[PDB]
Ligand binder design. Sequence first.
Ligand code: HEA
Ligand code: HEA
Ligand code: CU
Ligand code: MG
Ligand code: ZN
Lengths: 59, 121, 104, 118, 45, 51, 269, 534, 67
Amino acid sequence: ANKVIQLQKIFQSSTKPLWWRHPRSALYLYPFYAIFAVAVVTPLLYIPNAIRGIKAKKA
Amino acid sequence: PVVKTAQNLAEVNGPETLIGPGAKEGTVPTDLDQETGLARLELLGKLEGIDVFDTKPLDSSRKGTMKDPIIIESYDDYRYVGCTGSPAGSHTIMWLKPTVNEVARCWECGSVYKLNPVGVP
Amino acid sequence: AHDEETFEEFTARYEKEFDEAYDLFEVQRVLNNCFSYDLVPAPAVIEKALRAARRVNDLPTAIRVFEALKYKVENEDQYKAYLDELKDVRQELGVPLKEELFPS
Amino acid sequence: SSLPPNALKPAFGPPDKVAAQKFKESLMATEKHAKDTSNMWVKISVWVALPAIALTAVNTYFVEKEHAEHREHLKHVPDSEWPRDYEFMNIRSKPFFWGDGDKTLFWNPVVNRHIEHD
Amino acid sequence: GRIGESWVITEGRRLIPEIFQWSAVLSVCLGWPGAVYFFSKARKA
Amino acid sequence: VHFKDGVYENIPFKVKGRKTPYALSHFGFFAIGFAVPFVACYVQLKKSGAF
Amino acid sequence: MTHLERSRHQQHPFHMVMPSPWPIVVSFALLSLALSTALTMHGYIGNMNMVYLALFVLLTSSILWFRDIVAEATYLGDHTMAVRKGINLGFLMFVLSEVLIFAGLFWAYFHSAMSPDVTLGACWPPVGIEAVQPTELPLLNTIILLSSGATVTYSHHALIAGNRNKALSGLLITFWLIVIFVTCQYIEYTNAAFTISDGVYGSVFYAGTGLHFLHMVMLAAMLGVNYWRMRNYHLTAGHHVGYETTIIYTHVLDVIWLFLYVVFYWWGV
Amino acid sequence: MVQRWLYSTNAKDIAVLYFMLAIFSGMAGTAMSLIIRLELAAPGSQYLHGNSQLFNVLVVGHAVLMIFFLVMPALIGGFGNYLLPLMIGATDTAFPRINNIAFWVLPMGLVCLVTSTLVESGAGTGWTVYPPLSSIQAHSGPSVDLAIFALHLTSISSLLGAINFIVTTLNMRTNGMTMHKLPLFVWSIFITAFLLLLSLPVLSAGITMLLLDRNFNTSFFEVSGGGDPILYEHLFWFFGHPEVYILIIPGFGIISHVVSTYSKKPVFGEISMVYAMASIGLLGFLVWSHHMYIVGLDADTRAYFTSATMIIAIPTGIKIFSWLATIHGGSIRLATPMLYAIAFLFLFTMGGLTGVALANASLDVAFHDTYYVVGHFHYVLSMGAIFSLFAGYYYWSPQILGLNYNEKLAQIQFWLIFIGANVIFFPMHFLGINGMPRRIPDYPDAFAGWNYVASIGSFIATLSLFLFIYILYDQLVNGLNNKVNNKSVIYNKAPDFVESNTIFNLNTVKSSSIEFLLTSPPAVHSFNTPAVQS
Amino acid sequence: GKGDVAFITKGVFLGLGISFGLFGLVRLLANPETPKTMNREWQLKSDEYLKSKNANPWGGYSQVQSK
Ligand code: HEA
Ligand code: HEA
Ligand SMILES: [Cu+2]
Ligand SMILES: [Mg+2]
Ligand SMILES: [Zn+2]
């Protein structure tokens, strides 16, 4: 709703990096950091279970 | 404090003057209204008549040696210049580095290059 | 000019290019660009090169002409029949050769 | 703070080239031609595209009703009356890791039965 | 050339000693399998 | 921010000002690089036969 | 102007990008996705929950990357005409790489079709497999792409012109037009006589049409993003490179669909 | 420092990281080559007792690791990322995050390739990973899936680098670079980046077809079910020949530059040389099935392909003739990259001649999957791309790293790798024409001599790389002392004959490209202002 | 300069000797037993069998290669 020059006046006039410069950019990056850390550290505990060859407990 | 928005290229005063006014509620935005920064600078220049980022192959009309050099311009203390003869393609391209305190002599063409270093650091 | 250069156009172009030099960089530059061609230049070129090295007033580029020429020529009979053609210029200009200057 | 003497001198030359002003006046010609060629293309759309979509829609409704009544015909078929079909049909190298083992993504349980060879 | 030792002789003198050392470096850049076969037990050493 | 330039500020290794010698890191890098196929061979030779 | 306020700028038109943490995160997510979908295909982990969250973290990292690029393109304002021509040529070369994947799929279809094996009954389509007739639902979802192209090109030429109510109407109806395409394509998939395992015909047929299916759902996401930033006044009248990008993409998707449709539904039955 | 090496969208600090993974993976791949040639040294089950599956895993690891993680990074990624913006005057490349994600999706392909060789004994197929050898019936496990996910990731990395390179030398050139004025390495990286995005889509399509007929029950190459495994041979080698032309064309560019600058002469006909290189690029797609002369093609299409591979052979010939012409008549200063450039010509002409011996579809029936083929490609790939890689490093790293190496150690490293790699791959030709097949753990003990000679050579070729590692260390901790204390060579271009020393100190570097005018280690914003040229 | 061609050929021959010695003491730890058909006593029977059926008649057919 024609809110581009106010966002430009905010985005030029700060010192913080670009992916942290928005007002509502706290709701987009903290849960992302949490779920990304979980989602990328989690197969590195299943890889020695695969190297040992022990499969899952399914059915 | 008080800031106007540089109607053409004469009134720019840094990166706080290239903002411009926003569009209205119904009209599509034109590029003169909303574009900011370096793109706005290039647009304002091209609407005035000039174009910034002056790209041009250098003058290889005359040879020029130490009585009157070939004067090149740079906003820094050095500018890499690739000489290619007294015509445009005489000998193969030899790269010289003329700086603020030393002229650059070609050794195959023989021409010399000297700066007027604009600077303002 | 990628068209070939005949010998008379070669010697006239380079005589008018040795006449114009004023610094030392210019004399050594046009001397290198004259010697790094395919032919060996006639002594009408090289006595003018000796005068152009005399105008800048430095000696060893009026000796390395002779050693670069000894590297240029195909034997030493061409070198001796060459050097007796530049005898008196070498005399009144007073430059030496290499083999008598550095005996080894 | 001791500007070099090349500071307040100009930097770009004569700013009245006819090339860039005719560029700025061609910026009106592109907008006028766009206002012509969008009206032309929206007439192309509402005259050409929509009747073709309507005729293809009534054709596909008729034959989709035919395929729907055919699928309701082959609903109630007992499974051993389904024909024993060939070697390339219904290959199972390894079982599928999701589901029971014999089920793809869009596996319709009516038109794609696994016969299990009587 | 015109006056001097002839070009045939003054380039034969330059190149005729080069042919033998070219043959040496090619006979030892491709002929070392012969030298390694010569000492093995397949040649009833 | 333009990162400052030097002769040793172009590489990820710190070389001059350390606590350990540089030969430790520089040869341990290629030690683990040269010993990843050996540990592959060991984990493959304990899974099938002996070693 | 003054040298003093000319040397306070970029001195060359090209982009100088500040150090951004979205190659490293999306590369982490790509590694986790590859290993988890290599690990769950053999029953090492129990469910598809982990490949689900790996695909989701890849999707949300890449949409944060596109958030960073729309903020840098229209807020910080660096995309001048040289950078605009650069990203235009880069997208052209990327789509030239995508159509070669489609050409590899067409090579697979042609090689197993025009020289049919002796286990298919030596006839294309093979025995028993009731092929899809090209005139019922394929005709609707091959005329709907032409109508989508016509309305997206008048929405483009109304965006250049100056009216907003037309350039928005064309984008809204091309979004709903191609999502109607996608839904009737799924309707075509969910009642078809052959699956992806039923012979080589179903395999290469579903491979080609499913790759085009995923390509147009990615196009629909791209066009939804473009409609959002057309409603929120980001798109100008002369700096819409992120919209010319998607109309080039949808027109080449239309022509590769007609190639796929002709030789997958007329010649191949 | 985290924002300068982990986020780091600057094309100078990405190339160093490319080179670090390159030297790491090349060390791993040559450890695998040492283990292979150490086990093949004598008949009977050596060091790995029995266990032919482990040898298959080791040979696919050596092949695919050293191709897609040493040669392609250290030629395309590292050298293009450092030099392609630095020769055409761009401040650095276009799409900078794209060539950051290309580098950062390389080593995850590396770690999944490493962990593919541990689970369920392992992927053994060779680097040309074929069905039905790799389908789920004859090869069960999650190993080859990770082994081809590595190829998916490396494929994605190289394509993103290709789009990056193409746009960054099609738009951001400097003020005077016309469409034909670029140095020849820029043209090589140009044409290689075209062949990447014109070739590897077909590769990734074929290998994801292999993945989804492994695990998703489809039937692309499962033959009882409709498919055929010949379609994979077509779809693989359509990339497989453009892949090695991609790997060798920047080698031609590097060798052109070093023989141009170490003989004080421009290259003989640069326009005809770049026309020959571009025609090699646009012609390398039409000969993709010279690796498939045996499988059952017709004699007519075999006649076409054995006609067309010789017209592939001719412009490489005119390139080597132009190289002989541009080193003829020079003033050759035999330093250590010029030695590698001189050795590359002979050691690649030898492999190309045995390649056109292979190229006859008549003659390929006596030589296919036979150690003659190994002798050919371990000439033109190994000696070719890596002698050009060494002539790239020993020529460019005094300018990039800013630390001068040791010279006599560089020459003993060159002579050790030259001798100790010429003694490996030359008995492979005799093993080939005597009848030894490929990929055997070991062999019938007739030809028991040439394998022993090749194995006594591979230790020399490994010891030379250990000395190269010590050259890297001696360069990194004794750079300034090798500048000062007269152990190195300082000026790569010698002063001319009639030029004085006081006149050489005026014009120090007589270059023809930009790279030797930037200071040692160059500034992070080198071209603040554009670099003009006429 | 100044006899460094002598230093580099000394380094080359020293590297050849070092790699030869390390290949020897790596070769020393390989495997104790040979395949039984490697000594000359098996090879004489294995090429007597060849000359019984005149294989490789004009070229080489004798296999011994062992001391
Ligand atoms: C990149 C290509 C490449 C290179 C260089 C090599 C080099 C070597 N290879 Fe080979 N090889 C292949 C790719 C390569 N190979 C392929 C594709 C196959 C086919 C597999 C199949 O079909 O199954 C194969 C097969 C193959 C065989 C045949 C086995 C068989 O199939 O039966 C053998 C046997 O000796 C072997 C071992 C070796 C050894 C000991 C080297 C030695 O030369 C290694 C020594 C190399 C160096 C010392 C180079 C320097 C290293 C550096 C790291 C320098 C760093 C410098 C910079 C980064 C600038 N590999
Ligand atoms: C780096 C990539 C690369 C390059 C550049 C080459 C170069 C060539 N190769 Fe090679 N080749 C491979 C990669 C490469 N090869 C690989 C990876 C394999 C094994 C694949 C597998 O696993 O099966 C292989 C094996 C291979 C095969 C497959 C045989 C088989 O497996 O059955 C063939 C078939 O034609 C071939 C031929 C050629 C020819 C004619 C050239 C030519 O391009 C060479 C050109 C050079 C010259 C011709 C010499 C210089 C020219 C002159 C001196 C002028 C005079 C010359 C003439 C008049 C001819 N080589
Ligand atoms: Cu090939
Ligand atoms: Mg084969
Ligand atoms: Zn010049």
